[PDB]
Design a protein around this nucleic acid. Structure first.
Ligand SMILES: [Mg+2]
Ligand SMILES: [Zn+2]
Ligand SMILES: [Zn+2]
Ligand SMILES: [Zn+2]
Lengths: 1098, 900
DNA sequence: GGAAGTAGTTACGCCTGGTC
DNA sequence: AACTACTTCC
RNA sequence: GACCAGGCG
């Protein structure tokens, strides 16, 4: 048979042909190729208030990425210049207009309707299809995978959203009123409708419509949708005798009250309360056509199909009532479809295009009315061109991408791309999020599902509120892109399916559902499914098609939608997998590609629905005749940061989660482009190293070309109690030789802002006569131009861009840019450039050398976080009989409570790899077994247990016990103690509350919250509570009139204190209270409440 | 100077608002084009000034010094206060329409007045009585005092009062009650009728609820900041006031000019909506007032309520000066009551020290050093209150002019008292006072024994450091909050500050059987621990080379009180017969011959006699997070300084032992022989066969349900019981075979770190995984993964992991373990949120309860909650593990003291 | 007594950046 | 959302 | 200044 080492070649070919960001690129390419034109086709031509004029819409075209200079013209624009000059990497969008004058169409005019931002490495970007040298010449890292946008100079990545499958009805139990609830999320043109039917405890059927304030009896809706005959309704809902009786009982009390014509009026009463009968009818039919089952259509011709779909939903809820079917799981991945960059862009562009269409209509009507018809019909091209106003669409789209607040309630869709290292960027580009609120305890939604196998990483998920709700894709996951539904419908109908109009469903007849909607009926549904999959394997049917059946309820589901997470499997027939040794050799020699293997029907893509019908084997030697598929590589079920962990199955799951999460925070050469890149913060490990024990997936992906971490010599012993409690002891000599050394980059930005009236600011060294002038020492490194020379040492509070702004005090004010108060470094790079509007812009990059010290956080790939508790000289470190000195010491007390046997196995493997001169394979399930590693260590001349005889450095005698020592790949995280230490004696305060400001960046004060107040009270410390909460935040003195209790007024001009409310001058005394309480008294004296104060003598 | 004795809350009268105001605002504008405030606008200088360079017209003070002053807006037509809407509705439907009386009988009036005078102390009884009066008045149709129909009043969401009258014969109409007629109705209410409605005759008036004059909050209460772009960013209150002024001006114009009543009513409703959203934007049933951007505005109600509101965000808890935060790192070489402070923080934070007779020289030296050198000062304050920053060309003069009575803000130095806090702050030990010890590097240092109170674990933890500034606060901290105290937890009356992992493991390596140490090791460990000693005790053994050797028990006894005597069984007791023999020997006379005890010495029975350890090994029972017998006795019988000294010495000693003796954990720590592996394999095989038999019996209907649950639940419970028992048996085999010489076993049996479950999961099967107490079921239909046949209920197919961590997990078992870990990690956050909310509720309910000088516990109004705290008068912190007094311990201690 | 409505809460800090 | 508790129509 | 997102214990 085929070894798993031979299936590894096929998996590597899969990752070679298709990158790691193929979901974003595929979705965006589909959006550009067809999505924009689809949206424009939904948006019919603009019809203004003109007697005989209206414009049709032609073909959407997107040009090359170009930028319109403020005083020049459209130069070509490349992503580096877009992300350096704080531009948006967009392209002109052109739309043809067909003017219809009195029913006839003239020649088209092409007008630019706005700019569309371009995702990097897509089919329209300038980086597409460029060799490594060409990308390098453009100042780009060839390792960068694209898939993100550049908006106003910042890199924005759109995170996929794990929504519920549209147009699919799910049944479940309310468990409160004993009412069975079946809801569907019908989608049409970006609008979702929550249509639900309800069987209450009384046995009557109710339907909920989002815009109908109250539920309506189901038979009323069924008759309003064109079903005049009662018997027709009973037949359409179901033919089973029990269901027939239920529908008869539900319909008798409906027909005795509301007939066909009465139902629309009854709905209208609730929809449009009042006496306007025609308006009630109009509103009822509007909410029927638009707000009930919009996916079926909005025309009255689609009302009948709405009735059939509602009858099917009612039949499902009845079957749930009878218990013939189980509850529909909402976490089952057959019921969830991802929303990608393509569809989210489609919806956002739809909203922006609606705004532009309405604006152009307004402009056309206004211009026509306010200059008549002299040139509107004399030259229609100028009339159309001047009415365009294209900035609306581009501003809307760019604002949505930059802020992340999508149209509707969606928020956080677009997030700032993480560029800490390779792993963080790729994992962010492979991330999935859930729309549920993170505060609530979604126990069923935060847990791992069996359908996540091969689709979602089981171990990589953040800790805290987002646990389980933020997911990352497995390495084998593939997300579909929709195929045209009409061709699929036609092919399925040709296969033998007869539409429900001709043949009605029966218990002995299979119900076929395409894309979640019922299409027809067939006998022997298993034969139909077999024919479908045989056709797909033969190649005549596209890859995206997936089909499954259910013997329990006799239903065949056909899926061809977009956003389905799938995994590849090897087709097994009659106990023999389709993949053979010659296929593997052809793949290895480059004669065969992954797409070829998919097209020949050797490897199959299955989502959860089709996988339900599968019986998958995990190893080639486990295949029997009953198996339907074989696992290509079980180690690919993990995510990318989770695949960084070696021997992950020898660790506890929480520690694997910790390691996967901490792999995205390590320091290393994340991108070779870092030197010329302008970014707010960045790190650079000076000597990155390949993990000696590493998975083959890490080499296949490309992590080896951008490593983040180093291999340390680690001894597991307790040393002077300074590695106690997860602390770490490190070697001073190793640090001084370059171990874990790094540099921190910060890029300050200063813009020469152009205010109104020509009042500009100036880059210059300000004279001391300007207002807000800092010390003359702070401008020491500045040049006469106003910019700091590069490679000049800069410490805290020193300025980099001397700048003065026009006066606005009630001489020129100063607004120069200086380094942050707690940050030092050397000026690595000073660039000067021009903004989008044309003002001068300067970026200054400061690099600070961060040698490891006490408090810096270190982590291993197995989840063992820790900070440096001590830095010990080499002569104080213990040494081995072989001359090996540890670079790091970890307390043994952290091993057993955490149960990370994988770390010990990795230490053994690292020692063996170093001794052999060959790196050790640490793949998830096919890596080198621990027994082989121990035997090899024994044969190399060392103890098989990994324990070695060690000597104490301080006293010189050998330790009593044999010390476990090895090589473990430790990574330095960006949580440095220099970036976290903060101390505030006294500084700025907020204007509103006079309390200290918030934040390390603005000399903030630490919040002494109410929990600490209760802690202080429980100690009995009353004066300490006064000192901490009154003297040190907002202590003030107020004048109170003893006669009235209001706040007295002190006239500094007249040198008098009095109460305006009563005019008292003798009964006035000071009180001492926090300024926040005086503000509270002010807000209480607002909204008309009198807080009279009574004073006591003390 | 005065202090606030009480606060009386009332409703401001229109005359009060008119007199208290400094301006009447008419212009709905903020600033002019040049940048100066518009006279008559919301930012008029007669309401205070916030922009630097301006001057106040009411105070004459500059920005930040003028407190702020109120203004009023004379509303053209009165509006209804949203806060008092339901109160106005209740009063309207409980009082007469024409005369205004409460519509209650005079006998009922006098009886309810008498019942109001009584039962006023508690709010609940008064509220219930008010509801009863409201119901009785609401039901009534005719006013008893004057014959008049009382049409019922309907109330929709805010400020919509709608009473229903019979317009025609048999036809009724609802008439909307405008604020004018509502207010007039309220003025007609007499003063003798207010108490039965709950209103105060003087501090409140029902008519004042309908507000005709709106106070404008001062400028300082709604500041506006100028953005770096040059544009002005106003507050939400400023915008809402501008809109209110604009609409009020429109209404006044339409009223004086003359308009159709419908337009006037529409403008009136617009003004009412503006005022209602100004007072409470999230009031029920009102469209929130949205900002131009699209977000809703934050108004007075949002200013007050909420976690980010005024009360919780700026009154109960607020940001403070003289605080610091950085990562914490371990430091076993500082005392338990000390903290290592970085030089940067010590130089930044200062302690105000008034110069006196004795500290004049030191303050002169530190003024000479200045803000640069660490033992220096930052500021010098003369007695007049004028402060001067120390700098070059100032140090010599300020040092010369130090005199006496001046204030010098000096740097932190050794011995200073500070507050140290890791702030998830659950109990009162989350903040304790530590003595400052200045350290070179930039991280906080903490002794290991003080970790359990803070729950700190040196994995990136950060702790806040607060420096008390007044001498009263410093004394309070140093007397009540120091780390020497709080060794015993108030929760359970047991030691919370004790050895954690390395102290326990090193103590076991020290005191265990056969553990001996050389002369150099003994001297070095005694010097390292800080134990004072000038002569070593006589050695216990002699090496084969004649070298003297000391037992670990002698070294441990060198740091015990010479009077201490106690015996107990620790966790290392595996053969109870030896412990019973030792107890039988002790019980005969209570002073057994030391050599006789040494003959029967056992590691599982600790027996200290006159401060000499004669049997037993140091365990978690000696000192630990809970049940530290020796530490508890030392802290209860010898004081709290002796406990601190013993804790420091024993921690350093055990650390030295574990460091220089070698303590490691390797792969071999999870190894089992072939016999143990075979026994475990047979255990799992028999468990799987039993589960198969149960499944087959359930499939044939052979099994019958257990009481209280169905057949399916019976089968599930039986399967889980079998699997748990199999895991227990495999763990028992592993425990039997691994032995006590394994370091992983050593730290688990001694309680230093890890349980038996960890060793079982690491050296034997992992056991059954479960979510919410059930077997793994979430996945496909009839199965969990698609690698198992649907409908399978077997052990492996439902989450029973048959592999150890050492043996490596199969992919199915890996996914099952991932599910278990996920359920645990999900549980943690939900539990912490629920616990935090419950703790907040408990604290807000029990905050003020305290013990009076007579021994009782009383509520703030004087209500006695407990006539004796804890029903016996003993503080749980001072109690003996919840007991009033340890009678047997006292008896044995006294008998040994006298008869000894 | 329902049977809906309505309102009120849902741990504590801290850090970073980005846009208004 | 998911809990409670009132309130309040029935 | 408040909003969002991501992290840390
Ligand atoms: Mg921690
Ligand atoms: Zn007064
Ligand atoms: Zn003033
Ligand atoms: Zn009356």
């Amino acid at each position: 048979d085929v070894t798993p080492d031979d299936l590894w070649i096929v998996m590597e070919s899969y990752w070679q042909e298709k990158g790691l960001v193929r979901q974003h690129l595929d979705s965006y390419n589909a959006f550009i190729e067809r999505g924009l034109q689809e949206v424009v086709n939904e948006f019919g031509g603009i019809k203004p208030d003109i007697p005989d004029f209206e414009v049709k819409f032609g073909k959407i075209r997107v040009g090359e990425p170009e930028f319109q200079e403020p005083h020049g013209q459209r130069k070509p624009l490349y992503p580096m210049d877009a992300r350096i000059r704080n531009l948006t990497y967009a392209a002109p969008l052109y739309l043809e207009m067909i003017p219809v004058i009195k029913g006839v169409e003239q020649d088209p005019v092409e007008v630019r309707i706005g700019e569309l931002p371009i995702m990097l490495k897509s089919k329209v970007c300038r980086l597409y299809g460029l060799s490594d040298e060409e990308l390098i010449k453009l100042g780009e890292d060839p390792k960068d995978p694209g898939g993100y946008f550049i908006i106003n100079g910042s890199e924005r990545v759109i995170v996929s959203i794990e929504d519920i499958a549209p147009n699919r009805t799910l049944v479940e139990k309310d468990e409160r009123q004993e009412k069975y609830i079946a809801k569907v999320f019908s989608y049409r043109h970006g609008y979702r409708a929550l249509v639900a039917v309800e069987r209450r405890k009384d046995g009557i059927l109710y339907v909920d419509i989002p815009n109908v304030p109250k539920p309506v009896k189901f038979v009323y809706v069924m008759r309003a949708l064109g079903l005049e005959r009662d018997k027709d309704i009973v037949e359409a809902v179901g033919n089973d005798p029990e269901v027939q009786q239920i529908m008869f009982d539900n319909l008798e009390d409906a027909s005795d009250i509301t007939t066909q014509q009465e139902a629309l009026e009854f709905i209208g009463k609730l929809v449009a309360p009042g006496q306007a009968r025609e308006y009630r009818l109009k509103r009822a039919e509007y909410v029927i056509d638009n707000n009930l089952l919009p996916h079926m259509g909005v025309s009255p011709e689609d009302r009948i199909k709405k009735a059939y779909y509602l009858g099917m939903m009612a039949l499902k809820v009845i079957e749930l009532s009878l218990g013939r079917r189980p509850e529909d799981d909402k976490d089952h991945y057959a019921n969830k479809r991802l929303r990608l960059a393509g569809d989210l862009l489609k919806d956002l562009f739809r909203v922006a295009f609606s705004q532009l269409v309405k604006d152009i209509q307004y402009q056309m009507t206004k211009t026509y009315q306010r200059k008549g018809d002299k040139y509107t019909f004399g030259n229609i091209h100028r009339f159309i061109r001047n009415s365009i106003r294209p900035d609306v669409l581009t501003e809307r789209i760019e604002h949505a991408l930059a802020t992340g607040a999508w149209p509707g309630g969606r928020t956080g869709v677009s997030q700032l791309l993480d560029r800490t290292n390779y792993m963080s960027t790729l994992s962010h580009l492979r991330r999935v999020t859930s729309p549920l609120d993170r505060e609530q305890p979604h126990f069923e939604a935060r847990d791992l599902h069996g359908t996540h196998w091969g689709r979602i990483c089981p171990t990589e998920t953040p800790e805290g509120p987002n646990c389980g709700l933020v997911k990352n894709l497995a390495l084998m996951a593939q997300i579909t892109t929709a195929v045209p539904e009409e061709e699929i419908r036609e092919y399925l109908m040709s296969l033998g399916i007869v539409p429900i109009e001709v043949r009605r469903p029966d218990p002995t007849l299979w119900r076929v559902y395409l894309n979640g909607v019922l299409i027809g009926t067939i006998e022997d549904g298993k034969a139909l499914v077999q024919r479908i999959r045989q056709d797909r394997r033969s190649g005549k049917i596209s890859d995206v098609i997936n089909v499954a059946y259910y013997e329990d309820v006799k239903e065949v589901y056909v899926n061809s939608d977009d956003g389905r997470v799938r995994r590849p499997l090897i087709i097994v027939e009659n106990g023999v997998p389709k993949l053979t040794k010659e296929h593997v050799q052809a793949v290895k020699e480059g004669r065969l590609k992954w797409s070829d293997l998919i097209k020949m029907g050797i490897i199959e893509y299955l989502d959860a629905e089709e996988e339900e019908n599968a019986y998958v084997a995990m190893w080639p030697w486990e295949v029997t005749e009953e198996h339907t598929h074989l696992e290509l590589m079980p180690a690919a079920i993990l995510g990318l940061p989770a695949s960084l962990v070696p021997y992950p199955e020898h660790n506890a799951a929480p520690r694997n989660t910790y390691g996967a999460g901490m792999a995205k925070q390590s320091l290393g050469l994340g991108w070779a482009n870092f030197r010329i890149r302008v970014d707010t913060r960045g790190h650079l490990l000076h000597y990155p190293q390949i993990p000696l024990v590493n998975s083959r997936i890490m080499k296949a992906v490309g992590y080896e070309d951008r490593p983040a971490g180093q291999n340390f010599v680690v001894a597991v012993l307790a040393y002077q109690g300074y590695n106690m409690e997860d602390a770490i002891i490190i070697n001073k000599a190793s640090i001084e030789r370059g171990l874990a050394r790094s540099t921190f980059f910060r890029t300050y930005e200063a813009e020469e802002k152009k205010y109104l009236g020509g009042q500009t600011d100036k880059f210059e060294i300000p004279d001391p006569t300007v207002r807000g002038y800092r010390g003359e020492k702070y401008y020491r490194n500045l040049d006469e131009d106003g910019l700091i020379f590069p490679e000049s040492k800069v410490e805290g509070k020193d300025v980099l861009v001397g700048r003065t702004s026009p006066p606005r005090f009630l001489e020129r004010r100063e607004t120069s840019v200086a380094v942050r108060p707690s940050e030092k470094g050397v000026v690595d790079k000073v660039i000067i450039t021009e903004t989008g509007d044309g003002t001068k812009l300067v970026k200054v990059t400061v690099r600070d050398l961060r040698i490891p010290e006490l408090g810096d956080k270190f982590a291993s790939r197995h989840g063992q976080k820790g900070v440096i508790g001590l830095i010990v000289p080499q002569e104080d470190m213990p040494w081995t009989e072989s001359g090996i000195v540890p670079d790091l010491i970890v307390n043994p007390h952290g091993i057993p409570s955490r149960m990370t046997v994988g770390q010990l196995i990795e230490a053994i493997g690292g020692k063996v790899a170093s001794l052999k001169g060959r790196r050790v394979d640490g793949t998830a399930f096919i890596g080198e077994p621990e027994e082989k590693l121990r035997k090899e260590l024994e044969e190399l001349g060392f103890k098989h247990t990994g324990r070695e005889i060690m000597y104490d450095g301080i006293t010189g005698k050998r330790l009593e016990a044999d010390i476990f020592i090895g090589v473990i790949y430790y990574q330095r995280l960006h949580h440095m103690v220099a970036d976290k230490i903060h101390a505030r004696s006294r500084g700025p305060v907020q204007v509103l509350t006079k309390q200290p400001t918030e934040g390390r960046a603005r000399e903030g004060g630490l919040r002494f919250g109410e929990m600490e107040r209760d802690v202080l009270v429980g100690h009995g410390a009353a004066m300490l509570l006064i000192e901490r909460l009154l003297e040190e935040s907002d202590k003030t003195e107020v004048w109170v009139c003893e006669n009235c209790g209001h706040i007295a007024l002190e006239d500094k001009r007249r040198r008098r204190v009095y109460c305006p409310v009563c005019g008292e001058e003798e009964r006035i005394s000071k009180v001492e209270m926090s300024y926040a309480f005086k503000l509270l008294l002010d807000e209480l004296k607002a909204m008309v409440i009198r807080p009279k104060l009574n004073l006591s003598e003390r | 100077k005065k202090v606030i004795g009480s606060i009386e809350f009332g409703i401001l009268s229109p005359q009060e608002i008119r007199k208290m105001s400094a301006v009447e605002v008419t212009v709905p504008d903020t600033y002019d084009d040049d940048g100066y405030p518009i006279e008559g606008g919301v930012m008029d200088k007669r309401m205070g000034v916030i922009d630097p360079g301006l001057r106040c017209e009411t105070c004459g003070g500059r920005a930040g010094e003028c407190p702020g002053h109120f203004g009023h807006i004379e509303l053209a037509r009165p509006v209804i206060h949203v806060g008092f809407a339901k109160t106005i509705y209740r009063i309207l439907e409980s009082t007469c329409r024409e005369c205004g009386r409460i519509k209650l009988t005079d006998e009922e009036i006098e009886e309810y007045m008498k019942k109001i005078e009584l039962a006023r102390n508690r709010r609940s009884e008064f509220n219930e009585i008010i509801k009863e009066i409201h119901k009785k008045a609401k039901e009534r149709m005719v006013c008893p005092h004057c014959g008049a129909p009382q049409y019922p009043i309907k109330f929709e969401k805010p400020t919509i009062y709608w009473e229903i009258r019979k317009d025609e014969q048999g036809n009724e109409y609802r008439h909307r009650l405008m604020p004018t007629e509502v207010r007039d109705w309220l003025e007609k209410i007499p003063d003798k009728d207010l108490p039965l409605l709950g209103l105060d005759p003087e501090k409140s008036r029902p008519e004042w609820m309908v507000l005709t004059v709106l106070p404008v909050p001062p400028v300082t209460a709604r500041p506006s900041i100028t953005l770096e772009t040059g544009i002005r960013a106003e507050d939400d209150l400023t915008h809402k006031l501008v809109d209110i002024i604009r609409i009020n001006n429109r209404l006044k114009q339409n009223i004086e000019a003359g308009a159709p009543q419908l337009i006037i009513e529409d403008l009136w409703d617009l003004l009412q909506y503006h005022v209602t959203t100004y007072i409470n934007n999230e009031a029920p049933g009102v469209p929130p007032a949205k900002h131009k951007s699209g977000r809703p505005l934050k108004t007075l109600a949002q200013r007050l309520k909420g976690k980010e509101g005024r009360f919780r965000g700026n009154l109960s808890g607020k940001r403070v000066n003289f605080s610091a935060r950085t990562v914490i790192s371990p430091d076993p070489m500082i005392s338990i009551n000390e903290v290592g402070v970085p030089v940067e923080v010590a130089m930044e934070l200062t302690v105000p020290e008034k110069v006196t007779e004795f500290n004049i020289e030191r303050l002169r030296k530190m003024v000479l050093n200045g803000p640069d050198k660490y033992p220096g000062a930052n500021y010098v304050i003369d007695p007049e209150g004028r402060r001067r920053r120390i700098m070059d060309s100032n140090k010599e003069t300020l040092a010369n002019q130090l005199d006496i009575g001046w204030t010098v803000e000096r740097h932190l130095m050794d011995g200073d008292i500070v507050l140290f806090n890791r702030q998830p702050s659950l109990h009162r030990m989350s903040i304790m006072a530590h003595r400052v010890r200045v350290m070179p590097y930039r991280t906080f240092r903490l002794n290991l024994a003080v970790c359990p109170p803070y729950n700190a674990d040196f994995d990136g933890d950060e702790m806040n450091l607060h420096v008390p500034q007044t001498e009263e606060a410093q004394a309070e901290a140093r007397i009540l909050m120091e780390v020497q105290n709080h060794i015993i937890s108030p929760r359970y009356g047991g030691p919370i500050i004790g050895g954690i992992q390395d102290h326990i493991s090193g103590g076991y390596l020290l005191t265990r059987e056969g553990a001996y140490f050389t002369r150099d090791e003994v001297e070095q460990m005694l010097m390292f621990a800080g134990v004072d000693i000038t002569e070593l005790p006589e050695p216990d053994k002699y090496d084969e080379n004649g070298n003297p050797l000391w037992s670990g028990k002698t070294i441990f006894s060198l740091l015990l009180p010479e009077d201490l005597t106690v015996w107990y069984r620790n966790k290392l007791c595996d053969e109870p017969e030896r412990c019973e023999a030792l107890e039988k020997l002790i019980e005969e006379k209570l002073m057994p011959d030391p050599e006789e005890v040494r003959k029967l010495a056992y590691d599982g029975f600790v027996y200290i006699q006159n401060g000499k350890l004669l049997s037993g090994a140091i365990d978690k029972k000696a000192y630990g997070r809970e049940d530290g017998i020796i530490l508890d006795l030392i802290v209860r019988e010898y004081g709290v300084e002796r406990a601190r000294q013993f804790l420091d010495q024993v921690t350093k000693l055990t650390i030295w032992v574990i460091t220089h003796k070698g303590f490691t954990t390797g792969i071999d720590d999870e190894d089992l022989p072939e016999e143990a592996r075979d026994r475990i394999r047979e255990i799992i095989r028999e468990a799987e066969e039993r589960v198969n038999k149960l499944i087959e019996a359930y499939k044939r209907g052979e099994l019958e349900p257990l009481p209280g649950k169905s057949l399916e639940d019976t089968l599930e419970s039986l399967i889980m019981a079998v699997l748990a028992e199999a895991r227990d048996n495999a763990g028992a085999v592993a425990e039997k075979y691994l032995g006590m010489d394994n370091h992983t076993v050593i730290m688990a049996k001694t309680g230093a770190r890890g349980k038996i479950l960890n060793i079982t999961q690491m050296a034997a099967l992992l056991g059954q995984q479960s979510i919410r107490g059930k077997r793994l079921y979430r996945g496909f239909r009839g199965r969990v993964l698609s690698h198992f046949k649907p409908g399978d209920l077997g052990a492996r197919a439902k989450g029973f992991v048959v592999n150890s961590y050492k043996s490596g997990l199969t992919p199915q078992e890996y996914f099952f373990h991932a599910m278990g870990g996920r359920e645990g990690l999900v549980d943690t956050a939900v539990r912490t949120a629920q616990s935090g909310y419950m703790q907040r509720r408990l604290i807000n309910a029990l905050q003020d309860l305290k013990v009076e000088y007579d021994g009782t516990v009383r509520s703030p109004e004087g209500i006695i909650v407990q006539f004796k705290y804890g029903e016996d008068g003993v503080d749980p912190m001072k109690s003996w593990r919840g007991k009033t007094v340890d009678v047997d311990r006292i008896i044995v201690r006294t008998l040994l003291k006298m008869r000894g």
